[PDB]
Amino acid sequence: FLQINGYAVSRGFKDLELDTPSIEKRFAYSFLQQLIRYVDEAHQYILE
Amino acid sequence: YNLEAPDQDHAARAEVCSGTGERFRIFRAEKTYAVKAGRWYFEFETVTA
Secondary structure (H helix, E strand, O other): OHHHHOOOOOOOOOOOOOOOOOOOOOOOOOOHHHHHHHOHHHHHHHHO | OOOOOOOOOOOOOOOOOOOOOOOOOOOOOOHHHOOOOOOOOOOOOOOOO
16 A cells, blocks of 8 residues: 555665675674684683 | 775676577577487587687
């Protein structure tokens, strides 16, 4: 009924900015580099 | 004042610029030349890849 009367509901207009396009957000912030950083388990293992 | 350009973006257009009628063209032998028994061979040279 919205569509027939000509009203279109809009989804991501709120917080439409996400800033990623893989250009500003290099690498994988929370999987790849976070994994390789948590490999500091090895450094603390050496310290142990 | 140093400048950093955006990183290169891959091309995904797939160069599909043909007419709306055709995306590919099929060339076949005539139906009457259909083979139903034996050994058959033919050659296909590829001028482009």
